[PDB]
Amino acid sequence: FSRRKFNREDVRVMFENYNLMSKATLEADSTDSYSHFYTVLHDFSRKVAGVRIDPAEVDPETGIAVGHGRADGQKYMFTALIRENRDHNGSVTLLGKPLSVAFDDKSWLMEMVLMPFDEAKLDFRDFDVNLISEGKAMPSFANEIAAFACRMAVANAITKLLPLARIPLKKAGLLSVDRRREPGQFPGFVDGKKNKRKFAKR
Amino acid sequence: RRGKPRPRAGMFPEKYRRVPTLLKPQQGGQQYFNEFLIRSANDA
Amino acid sequence: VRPDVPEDQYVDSWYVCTSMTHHLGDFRPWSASAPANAYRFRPYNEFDSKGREYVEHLRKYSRYTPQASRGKGANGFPFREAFLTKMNTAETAAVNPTRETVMTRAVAERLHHARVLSPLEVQRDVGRLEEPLPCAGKIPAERSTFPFRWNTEDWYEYEVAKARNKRFVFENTNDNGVCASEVTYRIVLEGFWDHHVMKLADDVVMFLKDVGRQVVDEKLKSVRASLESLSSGGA
Amino acid sequence: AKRRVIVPIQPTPGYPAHFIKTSFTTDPLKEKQKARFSSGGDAMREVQDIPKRLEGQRSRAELTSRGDEDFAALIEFIQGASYDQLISGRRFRKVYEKLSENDDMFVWLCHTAMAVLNPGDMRSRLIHNHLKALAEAVASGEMTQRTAFRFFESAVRSPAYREIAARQLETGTATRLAGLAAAADVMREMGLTRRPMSSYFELYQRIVERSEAMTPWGFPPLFQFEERKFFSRIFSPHTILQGRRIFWIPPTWNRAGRFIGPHINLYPGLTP
Amino acid sequence: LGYTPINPDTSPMLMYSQCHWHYNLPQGMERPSSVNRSLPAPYQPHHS
Amino acid sequence: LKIAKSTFGFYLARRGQRKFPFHRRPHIKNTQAMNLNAPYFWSYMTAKSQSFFLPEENYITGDWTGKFFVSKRQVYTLQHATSGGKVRVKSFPSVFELNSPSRWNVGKEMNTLTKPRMDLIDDQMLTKKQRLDYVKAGLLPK
Amino acid sequence: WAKPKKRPKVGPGFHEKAQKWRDEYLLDRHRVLADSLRAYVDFSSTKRVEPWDTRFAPFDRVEKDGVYILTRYLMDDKLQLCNYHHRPVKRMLCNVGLMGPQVTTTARWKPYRFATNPANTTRAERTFTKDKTVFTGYHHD
RNA sequence: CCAGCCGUUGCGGUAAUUUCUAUGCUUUUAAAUAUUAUACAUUUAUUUUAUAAAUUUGUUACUAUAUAUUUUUAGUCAAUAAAACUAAUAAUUAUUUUUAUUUGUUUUUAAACACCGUUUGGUAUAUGCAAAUAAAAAAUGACAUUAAUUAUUAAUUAUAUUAUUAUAUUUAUUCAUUUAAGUCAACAAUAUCUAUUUACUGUUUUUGACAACAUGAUAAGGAUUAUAAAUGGUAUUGCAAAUUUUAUAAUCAAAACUAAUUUAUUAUAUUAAAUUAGCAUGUUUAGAUAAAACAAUAAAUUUAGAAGGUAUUGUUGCCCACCAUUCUUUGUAAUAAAGACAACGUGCAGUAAUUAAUGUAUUUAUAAAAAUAUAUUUUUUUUUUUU
Q1: Cα–Cα distance measured from residue D152 to residue D146, given in angstroms and rounded to the nearest whole number
Q2: Where would a tag sit more exposed on chain F, N or C end, judged by fewer CB atoms within 10 A?
Q3: Nearest nucleotide (C1') to alpha carbon of D257
Q4: Helices marked H in chain A — which ranges?
């Protein structure tokens, strides 16, 4: 203990050993003057020697699972309602249009929305996924920085629908969220983003 | 302005220090591992 | 950096770049922010913030009738999506499962003596293959309801009319409902600090709950008086 | 060069006299120099290394039923994982001393037993008493370790001590399990630690770790004890505050130009 | 800190000092001021 | 200012080459008052409609002892050009008059009439420093 | 502070150089006006080079065929009356509507100061050497 | 920053506890002042005398084939190979060198390297003369009359390849704006028991916030403390709280550039209402030069950890000689010496300091100094225990 070889997870375990012992046990251990240390350090005394799967939270009525996705901090926010289209002719649609029209029939973007289905080995012909533009609404979503926000929004959606699909997704990062943020406005920089003004020496 | 030279790359912080460690590199195609372990178990 | 408690306790300090608790040095753990044994400390176990945001509407549209809108403002509007896709009976023509699908299943279900199962009902489980399919594994998929592929110009007309009709709430009604009333006073307190206005908006409640209960009670004492067998007053 | 003049400000019902004599200076040159700390009532004891001395009847009973100081420190720290507080190194640091009060003494015994070859028969009441007397001096700090050592080695042991050893001891070296028996026996006699096994342990545990380094036992006499240890236990300047920091002093606006707060998660992370 | 005096009704450093409330404390009402109803003054106007 | 060209030099600071919002540049410097674009000669620096009434400064409100000069927003009429009397407009250094009248001036406000930035500069008004800077410029060579 | 240092007096008797200079300049203002106004007007009465760019369709088509037919027959006298300035013709040509919307989208037109060249502007050196005495805003010729 | 002061560091820079004043005030009471006298070490001390010592001596080494770029950073230039052996080192600490002997200048190039110097000419190393650091002394300067000192070393001074991690990296550049003064105090009218109070009159002595000096005080600026929510600083930037003792300078409509500290719109379509920009077409072309690592996408030509300062908030630090007045002073050597001292001009000699410094010797010269020859470290370090 003095040599400090434990981590933060152990302190929680030592601590819950202390709360859990009754004051009667203290006076029952303060006799030895060593025994209560064995308990307050129970797990750590032995540790010197030696992917989450949540419950699926679907709507039992409509069979709809909801997930959320965010990229560029907040400038893009989409949520992906997903249900099982039993007739195998399901579709992915976005903002009242098939994924083609919103993404302007671009491959490198419409393919990103596809990964969460294939990554989990599932077939999207069964699944009916609509995406809702919660963030700052823009005319055309034809940029990957928005696609990933959708690629994540669909990823989180499948997990809520299907519990053990979180394993192949999390190992491939589609669930994990970027913390990248485009620099907010600032007057000092001439363009306002990252390029300062000019200064000439005399 | 700087008026001093440009610093090196290493002294600058990591260029993508925000993207999660899971994404660099993206371990894509986890679907196939179950297909490949089978055919490999087939030949073996 | 600051104790791991529900964030709403902290008040963004002024002139002192740190955080301070609106509770005077006391800290309520996450337990108080939820009911007994709540998954992930939610008021309800079933969904997250967004999952409880959009399941609201999908349940609110299931009861939408042309009356629910009249008199009520933006609240009266149905789910923007569930209602606009309905407005689109152009694509609504329910494309039956393709000739290939009904084939690939018929070959499966009969010829190869193999049942076909939908992905929800697929036992993705490696251990717990006795966990049932979700209780709605047989929900009917149609073109009108889901997804929400809607009409463009109408989608304007909805989103605009929503923005203008925010004020057109007629709350003074003759109903018997949680929002039926003859007069609706709204008091808008205004303090520089969130925790100020909250603790205040908590106070006036337990104030108006007192005077409101008593004052209305006297009229209720009057009303039952104005009716009974030898209690005339409505003579 | 037109040196400025600043009138000294008298004490005031707002200005305590001990404040202005400290918070103010008339000399304009001494302005704007630096932050000058000064301890107070309680945390002063730790930097001064003095407990509350026996002032009166209150202070006495404050120091009677103190109890097991070794455990209370381990409770103050371990509770850093409850909701109310976060783990603080300053509280952990408090433990290290509560455990290693008596290490200054414990280090000295691993020396006198396991580094003094041929101490003589430590079974002797004569020799053993020399230790208990000196063990009374390393602990309580009456004598520094180096002086304590040179007492034990040159303690008055025996007449013709060199010759009697020449019969039992050929190459000068001698056995330790006779010494370590008496060595561990001192802190049994002297009520050093509440835990009985701490004495025998930290003796036995310091030795075995020392039994591995090259030239295990002999120490260079310059470093034999604490002295002026062997048995032991780009943006960074201008971006010094922005990371996760604990503000032992919170920085006000006039101090930090554009810093808003350490708690503030500037660039967020989606947390379900 | 100058000739222009500090407006005591709008300054935090004053209003949120120790000699007044802080913005953290329960912020209730300090003391009810019954002036007009304990010792009331009569209406002697200057305008006839 | 570095060189207080009037009483308002001691107070206001240049604040660098500050970029004011459009049409909110503080000093009304109509150095582009007379920039003759012959096609737009009736629309440039004039009333945007040709059915407005004349500005106030072309008229006399009450019993005036007398104006030293009539303002520069006044518009020139034939009565102006034909009566020929001394008509003065404020400008540096002291005042400018329209001694030689013409009808090419009728209809345009006095802003478009005077030349604000007189080409002939004063080697007398500018110290050895500020003149030197004109020498390098070639506007006041040597 | 660079403490604001005074500028010296305006100089003795410069006022007389002012009332003089401003006046006889305002007299020069007349002739440059009178010259440029004529230049503008007499420009408007002359013919211009054709505003279209022959390189792009539908003006690559040979003079015999194509939109040159309607240019030669249905509106020929008109396009001479409008003096082939690039403002009216693109408005006249849009009125005939027998070529559809291909005025703006398909048909590309000469740049501005390339379309103010008068007829018989053979040498390309011309379009930049228009006189400097006239103040017109490059409508002149 | 002048007068003045002075035992003495040092003071005087328009807020002097240091001059001058006046006044008071202080004293331990034969006054101040100026001139003299008034006690080395010896146990260890670096610049100029030693002479208790074994020396002097030593004949070996290396040259022919054509055919034709080596050496240097760099042009000059130009046959190219080479010089190894052994002395001894044997008898007392002594007895008084003091005019004697002694300390790296060395014939012969018909011999080379080396070196200075160019078309090469030299010169190329103990046969004379030549004491000289290596206790013997008393505050630096200085010829032994000058100046009041001088000298000095351990604080401090960011990049020299050590065993979770990247600079090589585009996107830019012609930019300006300000006017024509005015503070010396307060006064219900409707619907509450009536006031003409309606039209409440009493004659005049000061000079900071200013156009001027007048203490404080928050900014710009990146360079070595996050892996499970942060990339902008204190030394300070015009108007701010104790120094006053010429003076109204403030936005109002219609108004004139000289200013370092600035995205201006570059060829399908182009002025609608408070007044708003006509000459600069010339190969997105000089030299200078500007700004990113943040929700995006460039992850390496490569890093803690040893080092110096004559400066002393420290390299924009000091210093140094020649080059003038001076003054002073002599032992009068081009063009006296020494000391003083602040100009201008010329460098930039020194602080490992732009080829390390110091010393000595020879030579060279605008001047600090430079080249060659030896010691040397008050220069920084690079480190095989028989292959």
Answers
A1: 10
A2: C
A3: H233
A4: 8-20, 23-29, 35-40, 42-47, 99-102, 107-110, 115-119, 144-161, 166-170
Using alpha carbons, select from G113, G106, G99, G125 the residue that is nearest to residue G51: G113
* Residues 6+ away with beta carbon under 8 Å from C109: C115, C116
| Residues written for chain C | 235
Backbone angles phi, psi at F79, to 5 degrees: -50, -40
* Encoded tokens for C66: 């042309």
Cα–Cα dist C39/C48, whole Å: 10
Distance in Å, alpha carbon of C195 to nearest chain E alpha carbon: 8
Structure tokens given for C142: 């149609």
In chain C, residues with a C-beta closer than 8 Å to the C-beta of E16 are: 14
Question: Which residue in chain B has the smallest CA separation from A112?
Answer: B28
Burial of residue G21 (number of CB atoms within 10 Å: 0-12, 13-18, 19+): middle
Residue A190, nucleotide of least CA–C1' distance:
H263
H-assigned helices in chain D: 17-23, 43-48, 57-64, 69-78, 89-99, 103-114, 125-138, 145-153, 161-168, 179-189, 196-210
Give the minimum alpha-carbon distance from F139 to chain G in angstroms, rounded to a whole number.
17
Contact C182, C172 (CB under 8 A): yes
How far apart are alpha carbons A69 and A177 in whole angstroms? 8
Taking the CA of residue A129 and the nearest CA in chain C, the distance in Å comes to 7
Q: Reduced to 3 states, what is the DSSP secondary structure of residue C140?
A: coil
Strand F3-4 to G5-6 pairing: parallel
End-to-end CA distance of chain F: 27
Tokens of C211: 């005077």
Nucleotides of H under 7 A from a protein CB: 13-15, 165-169, 175-180, 187-190, 192, 194-195, 197-198, 200, 211-213, 215-235, 238-243, 249-251, 253-264, 267-282, 289-300, 302-303, 313
Nearest C-alpha neighbor of D149 from the set D162, D168, D131, D161: D131
Establish if B7 touches chain D: CB-CB under 8 angstroms.
Answer: yes
Q: Do chains C and E touch (3 or more CB pairs under 8 A)?
A: yes
* Strand A68-71, strand A92-94: pairing: unpaired
- Phi and psi dihedrals of G15, rounded to 5? -45, -45
Cβ atoms of C178 and C118 within 8 Å: the answer is no
Burial D101-118 (b: 16+ CB within 10 A, else e): ebbebbbbbbbbbbbbbb
Q: E 7-46 residues with CB below 8 A of C?
A: 12-13, 16, 23-27
F93 upstream amide cis, omega within 30 of 0: yes
Overall resolution, Å: 3.9
Q: Which nucleotide is nearest to E46 (CA to C1')?
A: H188
Way the structure was solved: cryo-EM
Across the interface, of A11, A40, A181, the residue whose CB is closest to D87 is A11
The backbone region for D247, taken as left when phi is positive above 0, alpha when psi lies in -120 to 50, beta otherwise, is beta
Nucleotide nearest to B13 (CA to C1'): H293
Phi, psi dihedral angles at C215 (to 5 degrees) = -60, -45
Q: Which residue is nearest to nucleotide H270 (CA to C1')?
A: G112
Distance CA F118, CA G20 (A): 11
Structure-block tokens of residue D116: 């003094």
Classify C142 in phi/psi space as left (phi over 0), alpha (psi -120 to 50) or beta. Answer: beta
Inter-chain residue contact D261 with C15, CB threshold 8 Å: no
Interface contact flag, C48 D272, Cβ < 8 Å: yes
Judged by a CB distance cut-off of 8 A, whether residue D267 touches chain B is yes
Instruction: Provide the CB-side half-sphere exposure for C55 (13 A, CA).
Output: 21
Neighbours of G52 (CB within 10 A): 22
Q: Among D120, D100, D117, which Cα is nearest to D226's?
A: D100
Show which of residues 84-103 on chain D sit within 8 Å of chain C, judged by CB atoms.
84-86
